[PDB]
Amino acid sequence: PALQAVIVPEIPADEEAPTTPEDPRHPLHAHQLVPNSLNVYFHNAHLTVDGDALLTLQELMGDMAERTTAILVSSAPDAGAATATTRNMRIYDGALYH
């Protein structure tokens, strides 16, 4: 829910795409910076991105990631050391999906 706040402007038709952050037409200008938006989080890092750079968020949104979950897997010991008494004890290791 913090990701939908893109503050790219409505560029007038048949106009050049601004690149420097000194003009107000740039999305990283202080005039077009509302708090709790992606532009202030980019400016806190002081990185330079364009209008289409933040416009790629709306098509990056097409694939979603639900939530991270914990996976604990286990298996028997390997066939090089699998005997009648080692098969009782298994190996237990865990991982983090997403």
For this entry, give a set of tags.
1 chains; 98 residues; alpha+beta; two-stranded antiparallel ribbon; 2 strands; rod-shaped; virus; VZV; capsid structures; Major capsid protein
Main sheet overview: 2 strands, antiparallel
**Global geometry:** rod-shaped
Structural class by SSE content: alpha+beta
The percentage helix is: 10-25%
Strand order of the largest sheet: 1-2
What is the total tally of β strands?
2
Question: What is the straight-line distance between the termini?
Answer: 18 Å
Topology order in helix (H) and strand (E) letters: HHHEE
Note the beta-strand portion.
5-15%
Give me the number of helical elements: 3
Structure description:
The protein is of the alpha+beta class and 98 residues long. The protein contains three helices and two strands, in the order αααββ. Strands 1-2 form a two-stranded antiparallel ribbon. The radius of gyration is 25 Å and the shape is rod-shaped. The two termini are 18 Å apart.
What is shown here, in short?
17% of the residues lie in helices and 14% in strands.
Helices and strands, with pairings:
Layout: H1 38-45, H2 51-55, H3 57-60, E1 69-75, E2 91-97
Antiparallel strand pairs: 1-2
Protein name: Major capsid protein
Organism: Human herpesvirus 3 (HHV-3)
